[PDB]
Design a protein around this ligand. Sequence first.
Ligand SMILES: *[C@@H]1O[C@H](CO)[C@@H](O[C@@H]2O[C@H](CO)[C@@H](O[C@@H]3O[C@H](CO[C@H]4O[C@H](CO)[C@@H](O)[C@H](O)[C@@H]4O[C@@H]4O[C@H](CO)[C@@H](O[C@@H]5O[C@H](CO[C@]6(C(=O)O)C[C@H](O)[C@@H](NC(C)=O)[C@H]([C@H](O)[C@H](O)CO)O6)[C@H](O)[C@H](O)[C@H]5O)[C@H](O)[C@H]4NC(C)=O)[C@@H](O)[C@H](O)[C@@H]3O)[C@H](O)[C@H]2NC(C)=O)[C@H](O)[C@H]1NC(C)=O
Ligand SMILES: *C[C@@](*)(O)[C@H](CCCNC(N)=[NH2+])NC(=O)[C@@H]1CCCN1C(=O)[C@H](N)Cc1ccccc1
Ligand code: NA
Ligand code: NA
Lengths: 33, 258
Amino acid sequence: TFGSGEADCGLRPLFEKKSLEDKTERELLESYI
Amino acid sequence: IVEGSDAEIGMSPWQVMLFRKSPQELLCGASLISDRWVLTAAHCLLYPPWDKNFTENDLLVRIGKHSRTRYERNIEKISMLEKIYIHPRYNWRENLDRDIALMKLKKPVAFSDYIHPVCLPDRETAASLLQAGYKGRVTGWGNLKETWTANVGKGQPSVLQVVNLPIVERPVCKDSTRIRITDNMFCAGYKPDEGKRGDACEGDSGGPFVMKSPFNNRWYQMGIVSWGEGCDRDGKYGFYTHVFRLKKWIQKVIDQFG
DNA sequence: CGCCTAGGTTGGGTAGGGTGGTGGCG
Ligand SMILES: *[C@@H]1O[C@H](CO)[C@@H](O[C@@H]2O[C@H](CO)[C@@H](O[C@@H]3O[C@H](CO[C@H]4O[C@H](CO)[C@@H](O)[C@H](O)[C@@H]4O[C@@H]4O[C@H](CO)[C@@H](O[C@@H]5O[C@H](CO[C@]6(C(=O)O)C[C@H](O)[C@@H](NC(C)=O)[C@H]([C@H](O)[C@H](O)CO)O6)[C@H](O)[C@H](O)[C@H]5O)[C@H](O)[C@H]4NC(C)=O)[C@@H](O)[C@H](O)[C@@H]3O)[C@H](O)[C@H]2NC(C)=O)[C@H](O)[C@H]1NC(C)=O
Ligand SMILES: *C[C@@](*)(O)[C@H](CCCNC(N)=[NH2+])NC(=O)[C@@H]1CCCN1C(=O)[C@H](N)Cc1ccccc1
Ligand code: NA
Ligand code: NA
């Protein structure tokens, strides 16, 4: 069994949960265009 | 990680350190996909050609870390393994096809600001993000250079390293090496005349190659650091286990029991 | 006091830190 986490997976407590961007994620986003 | 930079705290809370009990040494990277399942590369656990064949007791998992060597008190969680499941068609005799493995923890771990699982990709996310030029992020405590030969600089970082790299066209991957590429792999990295550099290296294996979804702000693991020839060489690209193409196997194992 | 660099399943970044509870000096 998977266990807990799937619902909230991929959401970083110190970033996404706090509407905060790490210093480089923007770079990834920009590459998607 | 070669040509990366120190990771920010809690930047990659799914990062996991595969650690050897005796002697005490860091073996590989890995990623937390739930409270009890960890994903890594098979070759970290089993690679006969090198007399490598660890069983559950030989190892333990360290989650929520940042410093390579220190024991981060009241922060990192150290778990033991109940079972190791290596992809049954993992081809170690040749090109490391299906370089993937799951490890079940003895007891579920509690999440925190530093310990959080990453998402596995679905078909749509895989379809829209696995595109040449699109960048993912690789993290690890591996080497900063080719340590097997005299080279200037430190060998290992004090802290978890990180680097953003672009997925590369499959025909380019294939033409960059004599080793046989399979659909279950993909390469990433900058081209020679493309400005930036970067790559993973020995010790980063099992580490996640993640991408952030613009459609839901969730981080997804698209790959697993698998192999390369040298580190950060011009005309060479790091190879990664294609997690989505092995998603079926992953889900059979994880969902197999209550 | 205000500094200094420190064990531990662990460095020294400072005596808090993304975490306890801790010295010895001039
Ligand atoms: C890396 O290093 C590892 C070691 O770390 C090494 O592994 C060794 O490989 C060698 C050579 O390849 C191998 O040699 C063989 O030994 C065989 C003897 O078998 C047993 O050997 C030792 C002791 O003698 C045991 O400790 C082992 O457990 C082994 O016993 C079986 O192991 C198999 C394989 O994992 C198991 O099969 C799984 O079964 C699962 C479900 O099981 C059940 C079930 O119904 O639920 C489990 C139940 O408990 C059981 N019930 C009862 C009452 O017994 C039943 C029942 O046994 C029958 O199945 C029903 O009638 O089964 C599930 O189905 C899963 O799919 C199966 O894989 C199984 O648990 C064990 N069975 C038993 C009875 O114990 C020789 O016969 C053989 O000829 C060969 O020489 C070593 O055994 C092995 N050593 C170890 C420690 O693993 C790797 O080789 C190396 N890898 C590489 C790539 O280099
Ligand atoms: C186990 C991992 O730490 C490591 C990751 C290397 C990634 N390198 C780059 N540039 N991104 N993997 C390896 O070292 C693997 C395991 C065994 C050999 N190996 C290699 O990468 C060899 N250098 C090349 C290779 C040999 C045999 C089969 C596949 C690849
Ligand atoms: Na390169
Ligand atoms: Na301390």
